[PDB]
Structures are given as structure tokens and as C-alpha cells.
Amino acid sequence: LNGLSSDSTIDILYQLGTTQDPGTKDRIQALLKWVSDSARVAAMKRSEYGLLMPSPSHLHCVAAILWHSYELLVEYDLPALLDQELFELLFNWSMSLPCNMVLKKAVDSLLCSMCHVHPNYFSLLMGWMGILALTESHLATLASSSQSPEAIKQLLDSGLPSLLVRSLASFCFSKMPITADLVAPILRFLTEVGNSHIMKDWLGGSEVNPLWTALLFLLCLTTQQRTAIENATVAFFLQCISCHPNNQKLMAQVLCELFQISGFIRRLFLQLMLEDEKVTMFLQSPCPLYKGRINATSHVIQHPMYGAGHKFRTLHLPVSTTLSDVLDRVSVFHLFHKLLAGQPLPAEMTLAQLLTLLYDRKLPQGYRSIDLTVKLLLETCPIQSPLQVFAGMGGLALIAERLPIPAHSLAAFGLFLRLPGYAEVLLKERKHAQCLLRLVLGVTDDGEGSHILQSPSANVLPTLPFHVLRSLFSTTPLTTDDGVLLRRMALEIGALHLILVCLSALSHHSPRVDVEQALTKQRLEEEHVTCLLQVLASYINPVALPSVLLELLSQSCLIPAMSSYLRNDSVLDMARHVPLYRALLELLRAIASCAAMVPLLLPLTSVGTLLAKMKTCVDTYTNRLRSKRGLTLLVPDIQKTAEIVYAATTSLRQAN
Structure with a gap:
């Protein structure tokens, strides 16, 4: 044949x-x-x-x-x-x-x-x-043939993209007639030509940015027409913002204006913001790259500049992909870039760090592909994701106001997202943050068919919302005005109430005003109590406070809880719950550092006296160990912390 x-x-x-x-x-x-x-x-x-x-x-x-x-x-x-x-x-x-x-x-x-x-x-x-009457065939041919700098410049100077954008915006808000059938072809045309970074800059420019809001307004028509236009719009926005910081700022601004979460806007947010960004890698080798090729006939019709044959490869990879992963996909091999001339790229960089470096080296933003050479910087910050851009403008707080994993963890996460700075601390773990954000949007899959619960480190998700909050409070001192606003907003929105309500249900105490299946549940609840105690400690004593705090912490289950944990006379029993007791001691040191809270330690069988008894238990235990001659870090904690709490209460009683 x-x-x-x-x-x-x-x-x-x-x-x-x-x-x-x-x-x-x-x-x-x-x-x-x-x-x-x-x-x-x-x-x-x-x-x-x-x-x-x-x-x-x-x-x-x-x-x-x-x-x-x-x-x-x-x-x-x-x-x-x-x-x-x-x-x-x-x-x-x-x-x-x-x-x-x-x-x-x-x-x-x-x-x-x-x-x-x-x-x-x-x-x-x-x-x-x-x-003008441009058919889908016309648009496909024009988009394909315009993928050159000269052809793209001529296409822009022809006024055809401008005509299309104006006509599409006029259609959305209701010179060239646009029907619902032509909307998706036109969006696909703009996406195709937006493969070019010149068209990508033009589409995020002042002349086109009305079209973004117009599309969102239209989507936030036949059912099939609506579906086609929605898919085309998602693809168009993904192409516009793909590794393009300025278009990411524009998309974040448009989304924030829209919010100022169901249907298309949810779907859009899931696809654009809660999925890893994909970038095209173009690998050129002086020797053929055979790994990954199937002997059967495959018609891989890409842009001709990507070459043909064995020495050219094009991979659409998530930006989290390491360079070693790229090399293993195609094949000591060293990846090189022309901008970083004569410098082998470290194999564990990730494409986000590479994009940061290349954009720093004057690679045009939105450039269609990373062009590497397979011949034969790790501190670099990864390029900001669109979600980090959206979060950095307070977009996640806006979403929070419109919003197995424990239900209280999700509810806490949704509430904490409205706090200032919470999303910025949350996004320091991009994949973990993505999992939680998809979960609060009613989505259990991670976008790749893998259930989030069955995903890497799904065991840290249940208490991750509270760990982010602890980091937020702990790095925000009382002295600074953001700390006062944060502490005040936390109380106002109900973050403190939720933490104390979760403490009641997890410590099993109440407000003061099979066998292994149950054991693992008890261990899970104690890990939640540990973080909740730590969250409270960082809210009170970061490493000023609302006046309704002491009332709230007194009517709360907190005093019941800490007294019961402090009513333990078995130092070896304390060796099995060290994280909880260290957290308990830190929450008591937090109260002992706040003269407004110290009243929580003195008699209402006080916690300060219970802590004093726990000290005598450990000093006697040390004496017995001396006589015989994670307690290691815990044996000084009660000792030092008993002195802090004892001292704090003495000063208060002297004041009275």
C-alpha cells in the first residue's frame, strides 16, 4: 500500500x-x-x-x-x-x-x-x-496558517481579530453578524491564534478584555450551543492565561469583579484555577528520541516549527513536572535552553522554576513552548499559578463568602478562607490547597480521575485547614494592625466559635457554661484536638485581643478539656499523647502570657493548680529515674511551663 x-x-x-x-x-x-x-x-x-x-x-x-x-x-x-x-x-x-x-x-x-x-x-x-462571512473552515485554515510572527502581525493589522472580538462582545451583551453557532468557532479561532504570544498579549489587552467580562456575563442559547460556548470559553481563557502573568492578573480581576458559586463559574473555576497549568515543551536532540513512540501509524500534526522525525518531541506537561521526568519521557542526558546558554538545567527544577528563569531572561510571556535541547537554580521560585494570582487579590475570600475528610475540617476551611492572609498561607502547599479548594467546591476528583481521598497525602487534609490557620495566627503578631484585624475578623466571622465547638465535639467535653477502628478514631480526634489547641495558642500568643475573648474561652469547653488532660498522674500515659500535651502546654503558656487570659488559669480545682500537680508528678518521676540510675522533650515542657503559669497567676493574685 x-x-x-x-x-x-x-x-x-x-x-x-x-x-x-x-x-x-x-x-x-x-x-x-x-x-x-x-x-x-x-x-x-x-x-x-x-x-x-x-x-x-x-x-x-x-x-x-x-x-x-x-x-x-x-x-x-x-x-x-x-x-x-x-x-x-x-x-x-x-x-x-x-x-x-x-x-x-x-x-x-x-x-x-x-x-x-x-x-x-x-x-x-x-x-x-x-x-464578512467566515466559515469554520475559513477560521481553521486562517488560524493554522497565521502561526508565524509575520502572519500573526498581518492578521492583527488586518482588523479581523478586532472585528471578531467586537462582534462576539456585541453578541454576548445582546459590525459582523454573529449567531450562537458562530460563537464557539470564533472562540476556537482566537484560542488557536492565541497559541502565539503576540495574539495572547493582544487578547489580554484593553481592546479585548471587555470580551472576557462579556463571555462571563453571557455564561453566568440552545443547550448544545451553551455547552459548546462554555467549553470554548474555558479553552479560550486557559489559553489566554497559560503561563501569562498579565493575562492571569486580568482573569483574576474579571473573576473578582464577577464575584463582587455554581454552574459555569464553578466549572470554570475548577478547570482554570484548581488544575495544574500545562505548558508545551519542545525538545530537540542531536540524536533520535525513541522512547515513547509506537510502531503503529500516528498522525501527529503539530505546528511545523516543532519539526518532524525522531529528533523532535513536543510534550504538553503540567508545570510541576520535573526536568528529569521530561527526560525520562523522551529517554548522561542534559537539557539546555538557549537563554541559559551553556548551562545544563538541573534535573529536579520543575517547569515552573524554568519558566520563572526564562521569563527573567526576557522570554516573551505566554511564549508558546519551552524549547529545550537534549544534549549529552533549584532555589528558583516557581512561576505563580493563576490561583495564586487570584488569591493574591483576595479572590479566595470572595469565593469563601459564596461557598474521608471530616465535615468540620471542610467547614473550618471554608470559613478560614475569608480571613486576611489565609489563602496566601494556604497556597504555600499548592497541591494540598488545590485538593481542599476542589473539595469545598463539591468535587471529589482531582481533575485527573484520581479521587482526592486516594491522592498523595490525603491524610494531612483533615487538619490542614487548622494548620494553615495556626501558621496564619502565629506569624501575625498582636502589635501589627493586620494582627488585630485578623484576630478581630476571626472572632467576628466565627472562626473562634467553630474552633471551640470543634474542641467540644473532639475532646468530648462540654461548654463550661472495631477495637482498633475505635482506637484509630480516638487517635484521629486527638490529632484534631492537638491542632485546635495549637490554633488557639497562636491566636493568643503568636511566636490586641478581642475583649469578648475571655468570656468566650470561659463559657467554652476549653477549661473542662485542659483540666481533664491535666488530671493525669501517669507520666508514661503522657508519653503516649505527647503532641497533645505539648500543644496543651503551649496553649497554657499562651494564656500565661496574656494577663487578660490568666484569669482562665486561676480558680473559676483550677487549671493552674492541676498543672502544678502535673509538675510534681514529673519531678517525682525524674527523681525515681535518678534513683534507679516522648518524655524527653515533654519532661522539661511541664517543668518550664509550670513556672510560666505559676508565675503568671502569682502576679495576678498580687495585683488583686
């Missing part, structure tokens, strides 16, 4: 086309003759098997040959071979093919390479399209 393609034949054709020897010009002419003969046979059939059924992979390989030989500065007249007659033949061929067909994509890659060699061919193409 003639004309059948495979990775091997594609590589053969690419080597023949791009091998620069005195016959290369004739080989290129032969490839273009095959292309022209295939196009003409297609035209006849519209009105020899290698012509009747040209491999899309082979047409794309010819396109990649043309692209790379144009960029390789060949010693023959490459532009002379690419005549306007061939361009017109290919334009008619592609215009005849239905959209989304792989053959049409290959012919359009050929058109893209020809426009890249002769930019005036893009003007001819636009004229032939009428650049």
Missing part, C-alpha cells in the same frame, strides 16, 4: 529534506512536486495511490522540512520553490476539506510554512477569504 507513513518514514523524509548536500534542492523539488500532485489529484476527485491518499504525516513532514530549512539558512533558493501557484493549490485543497480532519491540518501546516517563507502569501490567503 503506497504512501503509508510511520515514524521511520517521517524521519527518512525529514532527513532527505533537511540534509544540505548538492542534491537537497532537487529533493525539495521532488517533495513539493509530490505535494502539488496530491493537491491536484484531490482537485480532480473533487471535480497514483500515494497521490490519492497522501499521508497527513508526510504532508506535515514536508511542512516541517520547509519551516526548518527556511530557518537553517540553506544554500539553495528555497523561497523560489514555494510559488504562489502551489500556495493557491494548497489553499483550495484545505478549503475543500472538512474542518478537524487530520489531512486538513497537515495541508494547513503546509500553508503555515509557505506563509512563513512568503508573508505576502498570508495577505493573498486573507484576500481569498474576503478579509
